[PDB]
Amino acid sequence: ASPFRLASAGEISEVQGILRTAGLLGPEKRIAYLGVLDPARGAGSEAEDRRFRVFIHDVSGARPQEVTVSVTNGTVISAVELDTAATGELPVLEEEFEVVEQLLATDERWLKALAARNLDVSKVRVAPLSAGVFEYAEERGRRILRGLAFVQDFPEDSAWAHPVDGLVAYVDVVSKEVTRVIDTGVFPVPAEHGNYTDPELTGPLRTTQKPISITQPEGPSFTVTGGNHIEWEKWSLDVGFDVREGVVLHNIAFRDGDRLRPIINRASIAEMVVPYGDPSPIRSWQNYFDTGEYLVGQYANSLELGCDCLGDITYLSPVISDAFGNPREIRNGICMHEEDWGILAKHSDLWSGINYTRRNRRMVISFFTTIGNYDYGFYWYLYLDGTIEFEAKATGVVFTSAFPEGGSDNISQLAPGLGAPFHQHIFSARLDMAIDGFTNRVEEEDVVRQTMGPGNERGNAFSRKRTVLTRESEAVREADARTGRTWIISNPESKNRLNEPVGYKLHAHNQPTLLADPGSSIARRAAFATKDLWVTRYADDERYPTGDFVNQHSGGAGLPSYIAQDRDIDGQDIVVWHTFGLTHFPRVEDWPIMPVDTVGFKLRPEGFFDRSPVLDVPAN
Amino acid sequence: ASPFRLASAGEISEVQGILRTAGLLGPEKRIAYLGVLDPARGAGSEAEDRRFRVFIHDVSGARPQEVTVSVTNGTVISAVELDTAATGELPVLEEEFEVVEQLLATDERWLKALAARNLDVSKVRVAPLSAGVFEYAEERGRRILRGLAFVQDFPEDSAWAHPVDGLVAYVDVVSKEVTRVIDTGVFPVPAEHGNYTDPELTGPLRTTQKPISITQPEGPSFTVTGGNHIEWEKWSLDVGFDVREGVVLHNIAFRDGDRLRPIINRASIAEMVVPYGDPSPIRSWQNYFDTGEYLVGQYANSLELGCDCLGDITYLSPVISDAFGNPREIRNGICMHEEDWGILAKHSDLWSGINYTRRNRRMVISFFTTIGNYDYGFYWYLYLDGTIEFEAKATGVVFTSAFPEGGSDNISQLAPGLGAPFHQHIFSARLDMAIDGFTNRVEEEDVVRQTMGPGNERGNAFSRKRTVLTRESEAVREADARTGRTWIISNPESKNRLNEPVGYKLHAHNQPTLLADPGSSIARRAAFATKDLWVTRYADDERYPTGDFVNQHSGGAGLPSYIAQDRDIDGQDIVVWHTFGLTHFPRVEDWPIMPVDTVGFKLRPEGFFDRSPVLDVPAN
């Protein structure tokens, strides 16, 4: 009967029922976002109140609404009109992407542009992209999409191989008009196809790969009860799914003796942004917030057996709402399995004559998403030794442009005439901490070099220091790889047997953060991305590092507004936001389809246990 | 008939035969080191000359000798007496480790020390450690070992749980005398056992782990011919074994079309050092060069099936020499297998309606070694997409001391009274490059942030720069994680179809380098470890970054002496030396036996191919 259970189809149809009965979901209305709300803090001796949050867009053009519904009581808790010029446009609706190409086809400016390049409009695809906020005043309070053109020579052709550069169009998707068509000049269309299943380009496929067979004859070592509650090798959690964040982990905890010891209350990727570094006016506005503007959860792939996920796989098929409030199942959307992970520990002792080896493994929870040309895999891992890890795998087809004759400082060449603008992929993991409970504290730990002198006469000593982050005004931190900077989340009220606060250490990869100029528009909308680590005091309305409506919203929101409250985080209910990302100067090897690249982070115990927690792992 | 084949037992017994016949291996002589020499450059139309290098120690105390033998011709090429006070002591002999405890047992100073602490000498193990070079003048030209005491309460007890602090002894292992016994005061002996197979400490073992079965019903996709020549998924290499470096990879190359394209001519871990950061006079001298002083190859474990190595495993059993020149097989010393590696590439395209997924895998070549309390796994990986990776896995039992009452800035507490001095594990990978051949060049690539202004009006642009390292005086480089610094090795004379030099990019982990004071003795003996990347002009006598004899040798050797020649490295036969390491503030979870921690690096293609090299991978 768990309150962290996944949303069922019945609950979604019931939300729809409640909204209709209340006059809130007539035939002009559309769900832009629907998701279950996490139980409120405390909520112990108190039975549940399953609530759902909904953003309801109006196609006629009236003000949209934010609505909370209790499916427990069958009621609307609250409903309020939003002012989207102040607080930001709602997520882009799936039904509005189609509109961009359709409308552009009958627009004279668009056709004149296509005709100057000798292009047939029936062969010209348009990627409909999130618009952000810049110098266009007729855009504030409006839902705009920006269209970039790509030629498809035939229905099975990869249009990404044939970008139409020097051309961008802006479209208003509510009033259904083309607001602008910008043509900076004709660029030649890159001529080679990039059809990665065509034999002319692949050559004869390899016959040298012999099968690797991964099975579990007694089935998997984890259990799933209540739909989504996992127990595995002392670990305990609930796997949730939200249409925005995708897979969310709740109540991550570790069974130490007879004690269930919390570690992380909620773990999500709460934003991901892909800023482009090409100063071309055709692309200098390109910033996909895939989580915030698109809702990456809703484009989660169906994951096929012995192919996306290998081994003994347990699937979850999370349910979401479509634009009318009918439930939609995402079949096999979440993969769950365990894999071998080499050696856990090994020592061969001369003096005892005892030889000891133990195998490691990890629990994997994963989903995959597709937006346009981009494809991302999101993987959480739990290891036997208490380590928690996240990894993002980026693949898909790189976003293209023309390659300027004379070269470029901001674009690489993939094929003759074909460019790939430089860009980053930056993630924010929101980690609502609960190291042995909610009373937590972050310290920043740096290695300390010591001078040869009195007390260190051989000049070999080195040390470490820890600086407590006491208030949110001191809790916006940058990496220092050179001094091995990490951050320890500990519980000052829960000590280990050696009388030291229990903790977990966050190990970042220390990749570059947001490169854009600090005065730029993306540095303001994505302020989280300019720093590696932020710590806030928990509040229930502080969910996203960019705020609740990213679509076409400037600064004034998210992390920088949260931390300004300068609240006490020294032995309180806190939340860690770790920025981490890939910086991509695309290479020839990324074309015509990109091999996986990865980025992530991990947390390892740090005096959390009283000794190794894997002493009781058996041989074999 | 390959000249990169592993040494056979017949060849080693033949080296012994040649040395005896020449009067160089009488009954007072001992092999401290024996290894096959790599073929000389050129060596194409010229048939082979299998040569072996040998260091021959004399137990009576005469000068040791360096000898090169040709087993082809059955001759001594050269033999020369060494002056070990000038050029450094030979590697420690396995037979000399035993001597330390034996001699100390009858030494009055040692027993007086043991008697003050109420300790029975029959229960006191002594770790015999490499001595380095410090303020002791009677040590230069002498082979000294330093002994630290650990109590074993019974024959199957882990003595590491009971360090005897405040006590160190120095011993001369040729003349068989105790030169010094230093007692700084009695420290209590840590009382808890750390027996990780004892049920009282483990508790009942888990029964929750269900088997994971990894098989290959058609066998593995790689072939091994000529003992050690591997072909796998376009890759080609020879797996070598040296008693010092362990597993060495020769002729790493990639089959692109009908062309065999070299990448790395030779890849090894050419040094590894573990500097201790505790200023105690009992430990401030502790610096194990496991590769240089001990020869980690000679302590390679026998790796057992379905346990150290899982799956379809092909073993190699490399042969080495014992102290008398008899061959010794290391049975199942090298594991070779292939493993699944998740998704290689995936895109689901709306416009084409084509959905595409491909699985990745990697070839693994690995060995494991044990020195005293330390156990290390050394793993090379080749991926389908042309990426090459190394990873070191550290485990074993942490080196202990007493934990000072009043705490320590240089030691953590693992159990009541038990300390673990802070230390680092630092590796040097020597990569003799051959990117499409021997004419290579290194550039350092940093991300470039750009100011918002003319030509970048939205403030979104970013770029990259590359700086060619033209001479060895400019080729000692440090990491800059913040600017995403990497190093590209390219061939200026071999261009891809887009007319850019082919290359591979080295991606470091950017962990801290040597923390010791730059004026310290370890900063001088291990000068390589103070910088992330060094590039030298290839020479055949420049093998180790510390020089040919590390045992008790000061500066004046290795990398800093190599680079001073200031040779041209811009489009020449070059060698990259990448320093990378772990900095360890030991945690409670590392006791009583440490879970694996890892560190490494990788190289990925960078315009090496004309497009993705995995286009011809089949579905499934």
Ligand SMILES: [Cu+2]
């Ligand atoms: Cu085409």
Ligand SMILES: [Cu+2]
């Ligand atoms: Cu990218």
Ligand SMILES: [Cu+2]
């Ligand atoms: Cu004991």
Ligand SMILES: [Cu+2]
């Ligand atoms: Cu260590």
Ligand code: NA
């Ligand atoms: Na919290």
Ligand code: NA
């Ligand atoms: Na070279």
